[PDB]
Amino acid sequence: PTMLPECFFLGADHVVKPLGIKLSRNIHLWDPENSVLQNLKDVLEIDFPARAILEKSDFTMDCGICYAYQLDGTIPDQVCDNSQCGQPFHQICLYEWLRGLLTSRQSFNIIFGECPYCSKPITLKM
């Protein structure tokens, strides 16, 4: 368990880039004599939030398509690569939207096209 796990990030394309970079540069400082948290904190050079529940209780952290948290297991995961929107979505809902648009074109497991709220390029990898 103390050995490194299979690890990856959801979030904003502009937010997640540096985390991947920092993980790659620090992963050699992974050590199975510490704890999981005690290694992640000093690898990723950050602390965690302990349940930011009270402040952002009803901030609208939902799909912004169906407006739900918890769509049949699904969590808002896919976001906008934009400072002004940052709007989370679901896989299912954002596919069903983007599949329709005349703007959208599909590569192998990728769909390009416009964020519903701000109309900026957003990418979905199934």
Partner: protein, 153 residues
Amino acid sequence: MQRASRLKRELHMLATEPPPGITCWQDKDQMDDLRAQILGGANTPYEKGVFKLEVIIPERYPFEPPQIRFLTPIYHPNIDSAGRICLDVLKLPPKGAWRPSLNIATVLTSIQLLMSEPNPDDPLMADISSEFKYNKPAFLKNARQWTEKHARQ
């Protein structure tokens, strides 16, 4: 089910903080359908008119715009005799402007702004549009008499 989560918040939002001059409830006659009432804007001939609209949510809402028609009749350039509304937000793009970013309340706010600022560029009633464009007083009289005849009690 995306329909369900959307209708849930919006119905609660439209019960507690609807746009001023706008009400919308789950209709008692048609409990799948919704009843909207848009109150006559001041500084327009539609003043002292509450117009009933029927709001049917299509099954693929929010990918599909709501279905909105005036049940209480209105004399308007961009609203026909049957209550049908010419507005881009009520159509799917590329022609229309619908997206799930918007809601029942934003489009009813757009309809409230349309009653205040009729579009002579997109007329359903071309007679009424020519009258609005060239003969403001005749249009204002007819629209105000129309308010008085059907939207009064």
